[PDB]
Amino acid sequence: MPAEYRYKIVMLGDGAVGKTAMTTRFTQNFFDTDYKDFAVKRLQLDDINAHVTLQIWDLSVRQGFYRGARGGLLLYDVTRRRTFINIENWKEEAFRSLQKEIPLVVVANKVDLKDSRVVATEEGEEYAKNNSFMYVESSALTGENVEEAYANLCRIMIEESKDISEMTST
Numbered sequence: 284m285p286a287e288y289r290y291k292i293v294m295l296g297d298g299a300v301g302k303t304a305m306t307t308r309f310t311q312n313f314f315d316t317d318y319k320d321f322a323v324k325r326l327q328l329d330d331i332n333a334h335v336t337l338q339i340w341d342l343s344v345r346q347g348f349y350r351g352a353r354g355g356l357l358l359y360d361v362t363r364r365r366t367f368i369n370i371e372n373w374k375e376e377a378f379r380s381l382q383k384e385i386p387l388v389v390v391a392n393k394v395d396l397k398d399s400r401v402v403a404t405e406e407g408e409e410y411a412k413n414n415s416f417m418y419v420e421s422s423a424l425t426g427e428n429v430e431e432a433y434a435n436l437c438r439i440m441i442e443e444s445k446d447i448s449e450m451t452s453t
């Protein structure tokens with residue numbers, strides 16, 4: 284029997300970066316330009332025999348949005364530089380609301396739009412590296428690395444759960 288884990292996570296980023304489309308791709312495995320507080324996804328991780336149930340929040344209301352979150356995806360649109368400049372503001376808002384740091388994966392979304400991309404891979408890698416965040420290039424449209432981004436976040440939250448278990452068991 285696998286180990287069981289449950290986490291609330293938050294989708295962060297400016298308007299139209301693809302927060303909803305990424306969540307739809309992850310939970311319902313499709314994409315629709317005309318697709319109209321949280322989604323649920325159950326995910327198995329074979330390498331450690333662990334089962335994760337996720338609450339993926341995507342939206343006073345701000346404080347309830349962040350409360351109880353154990354992780355998040357920090358998205359920007361590689362075709363719009365302003366959305367990349369603002370990811371620091373989203374990180375600060377989350378950490379300030381929670382009054383603590385939570386793991387974040389930096390997600391450079393819409394990488395299928397090669398002809399209109401303005402934020403280079405190395406820029407996102409450097410920001411994530413400066414914050415000890417993982418970095419993922421994703422496309423909700425093609426599905427590229429979408430499941431990987433959530434899976435990597437799950438593994439980090441699991442290792443942090445294990446860290447806390449050991450701290451409480453000295």
Ligand SMILES: Nc1nc2c(ncn2[C@@H]2O[C@H](COP(=O)(O)OP(=O)(O)OP(O)(O)=S)[C@@H](O)[C@H]2O)c(=O)[nH]1
Binds near residue numbers: 296301
């Ligand atoms: N080409 C391409 N288009 C994408 C991708 N992800 C989202 N889009 C498109 O970009 C637009 C915005 O995506 P959306 O999911 O609504 O972002 P959002 O962050 O949820 O936007 P908001 O509701 O917070 S304002 C939509 O038209 C969607 O179809 C992607 O990976 N590749």
Ligand SMILES: [Mg+2]
Binds near residue numbers: 302303304
């Ligand atoms: Mg949305």
